[PDB]
Design a protein around this ligand. Structure first.
Ligand SMILES: *[C@@H](C[C@H](O)CCC(=O)O)C(=O)O
Ligand SMILES: *[C@@H](C[C@H](O)CCC(=O)O)C(=O)O
Lengths: 296, 296
C-alpha cells in the first residue's frame, strides 16, 4: 500500500497563524502530480507538536479529502499520551485515512512494557493498519527489534515501521525478526537508498516536500533495481537532504518552497522560528540550484 | 525563595483514572509537615504528559490552594508548544502560583534561536519568576550556558535553573556565567550533594515524594555546612535514589508510597504502566528498609 516516495507533509500557516488551507491543498495536489506515492499529514515535519487537537484533525481530514483516493493517506496519530493517541487515531479512521503513523512516545520515556501497552491499546482501538515510527534522535528511547516483533505477532493491524534511525543494520534485523511481509519505510532521507536494498520499500521523506519529482524518480529507479541510476540521484539529492537539517527542517523546507515560488508562507509556530542563518540559506540555495529546481 | 528539598509531586489517580484529589491534598499536607520547602505540581514526575490541559490546570490550582502560602509553589508550565506553555503559565499566575518551571522543549528539537523565542515569549507573557528546566536525557537538546546567561541577562523574571543533567561542572559554569544571584536547583537526586557545593541551593527531587523528612534533613545539613553529616545522609539515601529509576520513577514512587502505607493508588496513565518486575520491587523495598523507614 505504501511504497516509494511519501512526503511527511509540512503544514503551511497564514500570516495570522491559521492553517493555510489553500496552500495545503495546492501542496498536496502538486505532490501527487509530481509523483509522490502517498501522504503523511500531521507528522513531525507537519508541526504536529504545535497543532491543536482540532487543527490536527482538520489537517488529516483535508489531506484525505484532497487525495481523493489517488494516493494512500497515512495520518500522523501519535503523541506521548496514549489516550490522546487513541483519539487522534479514531478520528483519522472515521474521516477516511488509510493507515496510521504512531511515534514511539517521547519525553516521558516508557519502558518496553509501556511500549507494548501504548501500541497495543492503539491497535485495539482502530482497525486501520498501524506503522510504528521509531526516531530515537527525538524520542531518546528506541523500540528494540524484540518488542517490534512481539507487536507484529500480537496485533494483525501493526504492519510496518518508519525507521528514522539511519542505522540500516536495523532494517536487516527487523526483516528477519518480523518477516519479509513487514513493511519497512525509511525515515531518514540520506540513508533511504541503502535502507531499501536491506529490505525497505520506500521513504517517508522530508526532502520530498521540496523536490518531489526527483525523489520520486529516485525511488522509482530503486524499485526497478536500477541501482547505478539510484546512486546518480543520491549524489544529486544528498547535498539537499543535508542542507535542509542544518537548522530545523520545518523552517528550512518552508524557506525552500517559498524560494521556489510555491505559495507557502515562511510562518512556523514557536519554538520553531523562520529566521535562518545566511550560511544556512546559502547552503540550501546551492543544493537547490545543483539539482536545477528554480524555474526562472 | 526556593531552597533545600522541593518534591516534584506525583499526581495520584483513582481506580477510575480520575485525579485523586483527596490523595493529592493529603500528600501535600504530609510533604509540608515533614519539612519539604516548596512544591512543584504537574512536572515530569507529576505525569504532565498524560494530563489534559484542564487536569493540568486543576492539579496546579489544587496544589496552590492546599499550600496556602505555607511553602512556595513552582507550577509546571512546560510543553514543546510555546503557545500552550504561555497558557499554562498564565493560568498558574492567575491561580496564585509563586513561580514557573519551564522545560526546554522536547521532541521537536528547537535550535538556540528557538530556545530564545520559547523562553522569551513566556517571559513576556507573565510576571512570575521562571526556572529553566534543563533535562537533555528527556529532551535530547541541552540549553548551553551562553543561552542561559543571555536569557538571564535579557529577562528579569528568568531567575533560575533545575539542572537535571547530573554533570555538576555545569553548575560552576552556570554560576560564573549567570552570576551567583542566579538560583540553581539540582534536578538529579543522586548528585544533589555535589551540585550544592558547586553553588546549588536546593533540589527538585523524585525521592522527596517517598522520604520527605530525610531529604529535608539532608538538605538542611548542607545549608548549615555540616557536609560530614550530609555525606552520611547521602550514603543512606543513595540506594533509594537509584532504586526509584530502575523502572520509570512515576510508577516506582507510587509503589514505594503504598508500601509505606500512604493512601496513594498505583494507577498511572499509559504509556506508563504500574507493573514492576519482582527485582525492581525488591530493590525498592530493601532501599526503604535500609533507611529504617519501614522495617525497623
Ligand atoms: C517523518 C519524516 C522524517 O522521518 C522526519 C525526521 C526527523 O526526525 O526530522 C516525520 O514524521 O516527519
Ligand atoms: C523534575 C525532577 C527530576 O529532574 C525528574 C527526573 C527525571 O528526569 O525523571 C521534574 O519535573 O520531575
Amino acid at each position: 500500500m505504501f511504497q516509494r516516495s511519501i512526503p511527511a507533509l509540512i503544514t503551511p500557516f497564514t500570516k495570522d497563524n491559521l492553517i493555510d488551507e489553500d496552500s495545503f491543498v495546492d501542496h498536496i495536489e502538486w505532490q501527487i502530480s509530481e509523483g509522490s506515492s502517498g501522504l503523511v499529514p500531521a507528522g513531525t515535519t507537519g508541526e504536529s507538536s504545535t497543532l491543536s487537537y482540532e487543527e490536527h484533525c482538520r489537517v488529516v481530514e483535508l489531506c484525505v479529502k484532497t487525495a481523493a483516493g489517488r494516493v494512500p493517506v497515512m495520518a500522523g496519530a501519535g503523541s506521548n499520551n496514549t489516550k490522546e493517541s487513541i483519539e487522534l487515531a479514531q478520528y483519522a479512521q472515521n474521516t477516511g485515512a488509510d493507515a496510521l503513523l504512531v511515534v514511539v512516545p517521547y519525553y516521558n520515556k516508557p519502558n518496553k512494557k509501556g511500549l507494548l501497552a501504548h501500541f497495543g491499546s492503539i491497535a485495539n482501538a482502530v482497525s486501520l493498519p498501524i506503522y510504528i515510527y521509531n526516531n530515537p534522535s527525538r524520542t531518546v528511547i528506541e523500540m528494540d527489534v524484540d518488542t517490534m516483533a512481539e507487536l507484529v505477532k500480537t496485533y494483525s493491524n501493526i504492519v510496518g515501521v518508519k525507521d528514522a534511525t539511519g542505522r540500516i543494520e536495523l532494517a536487516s534485523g527487523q526483516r528477519i525478526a518480523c518477516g519479509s511481509d513487514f513493511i519497512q519505510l525509511s525515515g531518514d532521507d540520506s540513508s533511504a537508498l541503502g535502507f531499501n536494498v536491506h529490505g525497505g520499500v520506500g521513504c517517508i521523506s522530508v526532502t520530498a516536500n521540496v523536490a518531489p519529482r526527483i525523489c520520486a524518480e529516485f525511488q522509482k529507479a530503486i524499485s526497478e533495481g536500477d541501482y547505478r541510476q539510484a546512486l546518480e540521484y543520491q549524489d544529486k539529492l544528498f547535498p539537499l537532504h543535508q542542507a535542509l537539517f542544518i537548522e530545523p527542517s520545518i523552517s528550512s523546507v518552508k524557506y525552500a518552497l517559498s524560494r521556489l515560488g510555491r505559495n507557502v508562507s515562511l510562518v512556523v509556530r514557536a519554538p520553531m522560528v523562520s529566521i535562518l542563518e545566511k550560511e544556512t540559506m546559502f547552503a540550501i540555495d546551492q543544493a537547490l540550484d545543483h539539482i536545477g529546481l528554480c524555474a526562472g
